[PDB]
Paper text:
In our structures we observe that the overall fold of each protomer follows the general two-domain fold of bacterial type II L-asparaginases.
Moreover, in the WoS121-Glu structure, we observed slight variations in the open loop conformation among the eight protomers of the asymmetric unit. Inspection of the WoA-S121 + Glu and WoA-P121 + Glu structures revealed essentially identical Glu conformations. Except for the side chains of Ser121 versus Pro121, no notable differences were found in the active sites of the two structures. In contrast, Ser121 fails to add any additional contribution to assist loop closing on Gln. As a result of the reduced ability of WoA-S121 to achieve the closed/active state with Gln, the L-glutaminase rate (but not Km value) is reduced by ~8-fold related to WoA-P121.
Author numbering:
A (entry chain B): 3 to 18, 27 to 330
B (entry chain A): 3 to 330
C (entry chain C): 3 to 18, 31 to 330
D (entry chain D): 3 to 18, 28 to 330
Write the structure that this text describes.
Amino acid sequence: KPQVTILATGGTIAGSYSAGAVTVDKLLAAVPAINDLATIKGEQISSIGSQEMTGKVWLKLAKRVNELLAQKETEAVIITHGTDTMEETAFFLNLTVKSQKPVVLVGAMRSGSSMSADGPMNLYNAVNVAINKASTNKGVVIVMNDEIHAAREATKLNTTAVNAFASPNTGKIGTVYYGKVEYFTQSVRPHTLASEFDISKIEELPRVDILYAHPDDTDVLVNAALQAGAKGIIHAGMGNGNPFPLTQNALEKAAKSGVVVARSSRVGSGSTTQEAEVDDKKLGFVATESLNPQKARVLLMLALTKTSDREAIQKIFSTY
Amino acid sequence: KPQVTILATGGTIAGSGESSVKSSYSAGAVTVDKLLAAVPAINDLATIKGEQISSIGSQEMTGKVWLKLAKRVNELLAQKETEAVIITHGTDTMEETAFFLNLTVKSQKPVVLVGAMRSGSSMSADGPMNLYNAVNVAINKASTNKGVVIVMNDEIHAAREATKLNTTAVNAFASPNTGKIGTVYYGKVEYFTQSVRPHTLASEFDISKIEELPRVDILYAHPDDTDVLVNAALQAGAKGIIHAGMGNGNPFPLTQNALEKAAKSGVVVARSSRVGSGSTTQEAEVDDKKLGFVATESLNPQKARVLLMLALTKTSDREAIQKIFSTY
Amino acid sequence: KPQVTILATGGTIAGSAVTVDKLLAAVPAINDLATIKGEQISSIGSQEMTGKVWLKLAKRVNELLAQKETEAVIITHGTDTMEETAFFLNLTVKSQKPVVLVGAMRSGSSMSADGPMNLYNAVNVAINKASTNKGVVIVMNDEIHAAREATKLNTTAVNAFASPNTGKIGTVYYGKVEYFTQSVRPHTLASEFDISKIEELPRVDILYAHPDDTDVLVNAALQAGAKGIIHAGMGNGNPFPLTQNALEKAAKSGVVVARSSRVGSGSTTQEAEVDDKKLGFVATESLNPQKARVLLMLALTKTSDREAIQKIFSTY
Amino acid sequence: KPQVTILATGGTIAGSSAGAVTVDKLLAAVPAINDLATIKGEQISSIGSQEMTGKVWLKLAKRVNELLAQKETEAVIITHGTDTMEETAFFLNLTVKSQKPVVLVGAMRSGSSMSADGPMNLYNAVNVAINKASTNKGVVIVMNDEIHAAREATKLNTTAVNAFASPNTGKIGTVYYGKVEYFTQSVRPHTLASEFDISKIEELPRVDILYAHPDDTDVLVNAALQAGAKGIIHAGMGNGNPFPLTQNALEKAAKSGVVVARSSRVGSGSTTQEAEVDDKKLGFVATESLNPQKARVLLMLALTKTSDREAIQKIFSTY
Ligand SMILES: N[C@@H](CCC(=O)O)C(=O)O
Ligand SMILES: N[C@@H](CCC(=O)O)C(=O)O
Ligand SMILES: N[C@@H](CCC(=O)O)C(=O)O
Ligand SMILES: N[C@@H](CCC(=O)O)C(=O)O
């Protein structure tokens, strides 16, 4: 049997021999068929809802994943996670885990005690994906609702639906249906081993704020973010990354002062492009291209561990 | 043939390199004359008058322009000879304008917003067809009492439901919680559904005597979030805050504490979501009655901001504002 | 509390009339919402459905909703052809009272079975005051879909149901029901169809278009006594030439040929590439082949006139 | 600048010597193309895509193979009607023996229409064809600023300019005013990796498609058998399920040596093995994550090599 570690970041996503953590033992009690597929070890990394996630928990999680996958006996890692910010954690890991071994994030849109709880099947499927030979070198994945999503592309796109996860710019890379795993595509953007980021010696991540653009917008939130020590700002702009004039002036000021301003969009999908209506080279801004504000924040945070140069950060957004 | 006024809020959404000026007819505004020159088939469908209400990209829109636009639409539709109004508009904030109008226009006559995702000078510009289709929708008898609509990419979207969901695509407009209410294909209009949420004549909002709208900020939630943007919004005089929360409208704890403070101080805090679709629900993880918050339900942050702005012209009571979000 | 009848046909629905009693044992919270009566109308997978079962079901629903004590009907049904049954009922049930169809994409004995929640939500929709006069609805995966618009769009997903031309009309989330839109196409009471005295429905075949297509399937359908043919055409309802010739023959012989599309969404339009008036064809517009077949079947109970059938497709 | 051949299968997709009049009209309508590449043109057929036939597919595939064998040819672009572009693309994806780009492109709106999509689609298609990252992606469809893998692409709407989709996987890349970016690629074998070879083939095997529904029939199966069908795609209800009467007739067809492959009418997802239909007992193949029309193409090619159930199942589980 392959050996897999499940890292829990909160409560049980399913249900209502010790693997080595009470949450994971409850999961194995709820979904006993998992034991036929793999030898499961368990650890409790944090005990929070995903809306309480912090960079400190991310760094801890990434370092631990790296240390687990460096072990000869460990075939893969599964992380149970709240759905609200699973995309951010998955993306962070996708650029910080230095292995080709599978890393799978999984959660549940419905409570484990609910009628028609999604967790049991999601978890079962996640274990099957983790142990599948074809999952090697796919990068970090999210497995939800019979679907396998690349971490670069995945987002929570609905407040409540069991099918809330989507990859709006590319679609799912594969399927998993009652444990049967099939890949149809893979990301051609560099991840994991190919990533230039290394967080092994990092204790705190740089501060990056996100601003929400709208008509009759303001400068006061840019200024508050500067005042609070923001190293970067993601601007979730109107349409193709467009700011209101008053806000643009403030962002220009921010940029001149050494804070990295990266243009994303509030709309939900598509690329926030270079050489559209905003003169990024003149104003000192970066275009985040085909990401979303929350995932752009993650990438900018990592970029800021290496550099605050406009051109080098643009190149990072145009690569990853 | 019916008489329709096209209100332009910026440049031409169709054509390039046109003249306004032709011997047979003008409409009363250069932008609109250029539209007619670019799409001459429009003149067979309706008698077109034109006005220039503003001259901006939609990313520069302001409450002042919205008030001006709404009052003018109300005037135009009060005229016996005016069958409908079409507003040409930038795509970036067309959804906010449409939604504002949907709650402030006191008529059953059609109001149609239309734009173009591609420049009129571009290869394969979408504006000419979008505009032609918009005119056909504006004059169609079935468009009466549908509320304010957006017409883009052969589709008719209810203002309550519409959003720009993509940065660049000609098909960027969607109604993610309900779909389009109708279609328009080479001018052929069909409706399949209609909103059952009150709009236009049935709206309780009235902006005829309003000069400035209340200030409502929007915040973007994320892990390791902060209190400093709530505080800055309070300091700047925010009457309301839309919180674009994680998942089903969930805040980070530090931010929640600041929002609770904001609520206690009389600022209306309304929970929406960053995710893109679905309802930010009551009686989920956030105790809204205890904390003093409103749940915006099936809107999005930007449209929730509009509704809260209008609500704040009448009241800042939590229960009354919740009822407004649960009605409109 | 309101009285509701659940009709089982049934499919694989909740838990590991007896079927309805098992549902109530699996989802006991339903008993707090309504007084549930149960009947077994058929005992089949929905891939075995027939016009005889549809007629029986519709007559029974009409009888039940004519009763003063009956607030609504819920029909448990297999997912494969739920859309066809819902659409049929939408044009044949003569009442404003709610009719809700509900099923499950996963077996009731499966991990994470969808049936229990679907059923619970369906009862809540059936008894909601806003569900009156919405027409027949499908309730699946927290969503309320109008029968006219609904289709099964995926082979296996719990979210397989969609309304690709319009979206869902409402939501139901842990029993909380909200409507955001409603159909403006006539249904139920406003329908001109009446099946109370009908024992067999007219035969309507469906053909699948493709490059290098054939005439032999048109001919076989004619030979087998087809009163209508739905052609699931390429793109905007377009036939291969050999097939078109055969369909023209079929039309001249009195068989109604209606153009739909294989693509999955959008309207198969009039006045596109196919000269329908010349060739003798009807354009089905914004339906799909399977639902167009239902509507043509009903139309054929009243008429086989091209213009009248086009008017029916342009109305319903 | 790179040399690219545009093969036209019908009229102009844009506007109202490269070596073919259609292609010269395209260059007149979209002159910016000439800055990107040296364009040669050929007229392979002169038809709407609803009139496509295997004969035109064979001709097209052989010609593409010839053109890409030429050192001077960087890529091929094929202008095509939208209705059956997905079939032609899928066929070429399994028959073109090269890593050089092959790009299919069309227009949902007529070139003479207001807001015609052809000019931009064509411009974008040339940019994709000449991009270095398009090598070894397989055959692609370029429409509405999107790059779709041939295996996954389908026309999903009757009229919309955004009618093309990849419902099981999404687009593999984007092209926006000529700027090309790939985000994914297919991991299913295509082009050079395909086992199919049509260089000596003159006619493809006959494969019919049947549309399933309640109260279904056996007469269409029988007519297809009578007409010489080597295979039948059954577009089944839900997860590839037949009506009983029809299943009996398909079982008969299978026993008689006709390959029966189960797909679905629904639009997306896999028609799976080991669901409600006992394929091994009845003699059927499950087409998995394709659609009826593309399953037909793959079965047609499979039938040039074998009519064995197990070998055809393996083909559907591979490509
Ligand atoms: N807000 C919770 C919801 C539970 C879930 O859907 O995962 C979380 O993300 O932690
Ligand atoms: N972003 C500008 C450009 C035009 C458009 O995209 O509609 C605007 O919103 O006005
Ligand atoms: N194909 C079966 C699946 C089981 C179910 O849907 O209940 C049916 O349509 O009945
Ligand atoms: N049905 C025609 C029209 C052109 C088009 O839609 O691309 C074809 O496919 O050739």
